[PDB]
Amino acid sequence: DQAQVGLIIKVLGRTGSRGNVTQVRVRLMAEEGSPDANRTIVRNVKGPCKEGDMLSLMETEREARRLR
Amino acid sequence: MTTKRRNHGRAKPPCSRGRTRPVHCFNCGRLAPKDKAVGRFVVRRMLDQASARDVAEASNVYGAGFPMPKLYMKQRFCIACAIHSRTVRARPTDMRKRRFTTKV
Amino acid sequence: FYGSSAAKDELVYGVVHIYASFNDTFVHVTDMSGRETFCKITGGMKVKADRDESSPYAAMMAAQDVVARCKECGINALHVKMRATGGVGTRSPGPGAQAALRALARAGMKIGRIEDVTPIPTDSTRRKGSRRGRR
Amino acid sequence: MSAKAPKLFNKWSYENLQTTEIALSDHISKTATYVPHSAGRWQKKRFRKARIPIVERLTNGLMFKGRGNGKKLQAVRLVKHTLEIIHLLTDQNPLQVVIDAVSKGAPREDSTRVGSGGVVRRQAVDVSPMRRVNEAIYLMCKGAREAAFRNLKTLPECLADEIVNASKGSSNSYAIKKKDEVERVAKANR
């Protein structure tokens, strides 16, 4: 795997409609000053989240919702 | 029957033309008169903000170097078309008479 | 090597035609000539199931095998030309646009002088459809 | 003195322990209490369930399916045995093995139904921290009941087996196979 920490920088808002999934933004604290222009990816999350929560990322360069 | 709309859903006034050319739709290919047809102007981005950053990094002569172009188009829609993507919606009586002219 | 050896240690400008539609996405390779080419990639090779061959994921997965084959052709810098659809189609690209660009940039290829090159008519033939539309 | 500042299960020490992951550190907490037996109010608020260790949470969700099942005190009787077993098998403090297993059996990415058009669509959806914890626990301790259901001769021992193999990443464990197969859809389709 890749386990790449990121801090939930804020609650982006509510996306989905099941009452299940929320769409939230992740900020990379994984970087040590390595170049990232991404630089804060939006990620869909499963279950409850809170700000300052670290979580591992199995993927990077995610725009989440897209047009689909 | 009842005159629901004075201008009849047209920008064509009575006693002038009585005929204005048909125009295709960019959805379903339906034809309607130009005046009836529902015009919008899009100004569609060629990159999302999120991706704009990443590409402007790898650029030197572009992005920072010149502001990115956009795809411009006019979009003439049918009635049914418009309503279903909810960019035109039903309004109460007082509001239906309002216009905003050709400005956004 | 196979690529540059008389343009080596200097950037070389390819051109990349990107055609995004709602059935597939294409990524092509041209060299500021268009008379000779090195690779033709389709979404449908990377991802199977026809719905998902025009999806964002298709684009990005394909894009990495642009970069793979460009660095063997001496190509480093890439001009890009984004194309929507035909002149009797729409004026909208599919979802495979905006995905491909970012995938290439992040993969260390330079990108400059992006353009919008698409066939828009002064006027053309009767558009496919009917008077009453598709319904 | 010698039980004022010192804190044990009854011989198992919490100094040794370290949180294995850095994704999780506010949903995995350390024990100080000498039994995982509950007596408090454990929920009232959205996060108030992460103020407490994985041990307590696990022992409560250990089994259900009542018929005259002895609930909490009974569960604790099995906890004791399973800790001794895990200890001599890893040759290391059993507690710290639990810390590991909960993290490494958890699915870290998922994919869900969320599409429309008479059809479903799947996207890569990251698993939240508390969910990694909870889901892992449930799967491990589901495995237990199924293993002894008509089968084996073992009563606590299956728990110890599972917790070991989970910490090793071995696909014997009921938790590990789930993480595996889910991620083969959620990193093969976005």
**Tokens of residue D43, six digits:** 């929920």
Taking CA B44 as the corner, what is the angle to CA C32 and CA B40, rounded to the nearest 5 degrees? 135
Count the domains in chain C: 1
How many CA atoms, within 13 angstroms, populate the side-chain half-sphere of residue D156?
15
User: Can chain B be said to touch chain C, i.e. do they have 3 or more Cβ pairs within 8 angstroms?
Assistant: yes
CATH code, C105: 3.30.420.80
What is the residue range of B21's domain? 1-104
**Spatial contact of B21 and C67, defined as CB atoms under 8 Å apart:** no
**Tokens of residue B17, six digits:** 């033309």
For A56, the enclosing helix (H) or strand (E) is strand A54-57
- Cα separation, D188 vs D133, in Å, equals 24
**Spatial contact of D131 and A56, defined as CB atoms under 8 Å apart:** no
A vs B, Cβ pairs < 8 A, gives 14
User: Can chain B be said to touch chain D, i.e. do they have 3 or more Cβ pairs within 8 angstroms?
Assistant: no
- Cα separation, D30 vs D16, in Å, equals 11
- Cα separation, B48 vs C43, in Å, equals 21
Is D189 close to C56, i.e. CB distance below 8 A?
A: no
Chain A CB contacts of B54 below 8 Å = 37-38
- Cα separation, C111 vs C113, in Å, equals 7
Which one of C60, C95, C102 has the shortest CB-CB distance to A67? C95
**Spatial contact of D133 and D102, defined as CB atoms under 8 Å apart:** yes
Nearest to C20 by CA among C48, C42, C49, C46: C42
Taking CA D15 as the corner, what is the angle to CA D9 and CA D21, rounded to the nearest 5 degrees? 105
**DSSP 8-class letter at B93:** H
**Spatial contact of C103 and C63, defined as CB atoms under 8 Å apart:** yes
Query: Roughly what angle, to the nearest 10 degrees, separates helices D129-147 and D94-104?
Result: 110
Chain C CB contacts of B78 below 8 Å = 133
Is A37 close to B57, i.e. CB distance below 8 A?
A: yes
- Cα separation, D135 vs D118, in Å, equals 30
Q: Does domain A1-68 have CATH number 2.40.50.140?
A: yes
Establish if A66 touches chain B: CB-CB under 8 angstroms.
no
User: Can chain C be said to touch chain A, i.e. do they have 3 or more Cβ pairs within 8 angstroms?
Assistant: yes
- D124-127 β-sheet, strand order: A54-57, A4-13, A21-28, A42-46, D124-127, D109-111
Q: Which long-range contacts (CB under 8 A, 24 or more apart) does C60-64 make?
A: C60/A61, C60/C99, C60/C100, C60/C102, C60/C103, C62/C25, C62/C27, C62/C100, C63/C27, C63/C99, C63/C100, C63/C103, C63/C104, C63/C107, C64/C103, C64/C107
Is C106 close to A61, i.e. CB distance below 8 A?
A: yes
Count the domains in chain D: 1
Nearest to A44 by CA among D180, D123, D24, D135: D123
Is A3 close to D112, i.e. CB distance below 8 A?
A: no
How close A48 gets to chain B, by Cα (Å)?
A: 25
Residues 3 to 62 of A: which have CB under 8 A from any D CB? 3, 5, 16, 18, 20-21, 26, 43-50, 53-59, 62
Sign of CA dihedral B73, B78, B80, B82: positive
Q: Dihedral through CA B48, CA B53, CA B57, CA B63, nearest 10?
A: 60
Residues 6+ apart with CB under 8 A from B43: B70, B72
Chain D CB contacts of A59 below 8 Å = 109, 124, 126, 187, 190
CA distances from D67 to C41, D64, D70, D145, D162 (A): 63, 9, 9, 14, 25
Helices and strands in chain C: count of H runs, count of E runs: 3, 5
Shortest CA distance from D121: residue in chain A: A68
How much helix, strand and coil, in percent to the nearest 5, is found in chain D?
40, 5, 55
Shortest CA distance from C82: residue in chain B: B46
Chains near C, with 3+ CB pairs < 8 A? A, B, D
**Spatial contact of D14 and D99, defined as CB atoms under 8 Å apart:** no
What is the residue range of C135's domain? 1-135
- Cα separation, D128 vs C80, in Å, equals 39
DSSP per residue, B42-70: --B-SS-HHHHHHHHHH-SSSTTSSPPP-
Establish if C60 touches chain A: CB-CB under 8 angstroms.
yes
**Spatial contact of D163 and D98, defined as CB atoms under 8 Å apart:** yes
CA distances from D64 to D24, D47, D69, D75 (A): 27, 24, 8, 10
Query: Roughly what angle, to the nearest 10 degrees, separates helices D157-168 and D94-104?
Result: 60
Terminal Cα-to-Cα distance of chain C (whole angstroms): 57
Is C133 close to B30, i.e. CB distance below 8 A?
A: yes
Please name the amino acid found at residue D50: A
Chains near D, with 3+ CB pairs < 8 A? A, C
Helices and strands in chain D: count of H runs, count of E runs: 6, 2
The tokens 């870290």 sit on which residue?
A: D108
How close C39 gets to chain B, by Cα (Å)?
A: 22
CATH code, B68: 3.30.1740.20
**Spatial contact of C77 and C12, defined as CB atoms under 8 Å apart:** yes
Shortest CA distance from A21: residue in chain D: D125
**Spatial contact of C79 and C112, defined as CB atoms under 8 Å apart:** yes
- Cα separation, B90 vs B72, in Å, equals 28
- Cα separation, B55 vs B68, in Å, equals 11
Shortest CA distance from A25: residue in chain D: D126
**Residue C132 burial by CB count (10 A; 0-12/13-18/19+): exposed, middle or buried?**
exposed
Chain A CB contacts of D20 below 8 Å = none
Establish if B51 touches chain C: CB-CB under 8 angstroms.
yes
How close A7 gets to chain C, by Cα (Å)?
A: 22
**Tokens of residue B78, six digits:** 């049918």
DSSP per residue, C17-78: EEEE-SS-EEEE-B-SSSS--S-EEEHHHHS-SGGGGSSHHHHHHHHHHHHHHHTTTT--EE
Count the domains in chain B: 1
Please give the resolution of this entry in Å, rounded to 1 decimal. 4.0
Per-domain residue ranges of chain A? 1-68
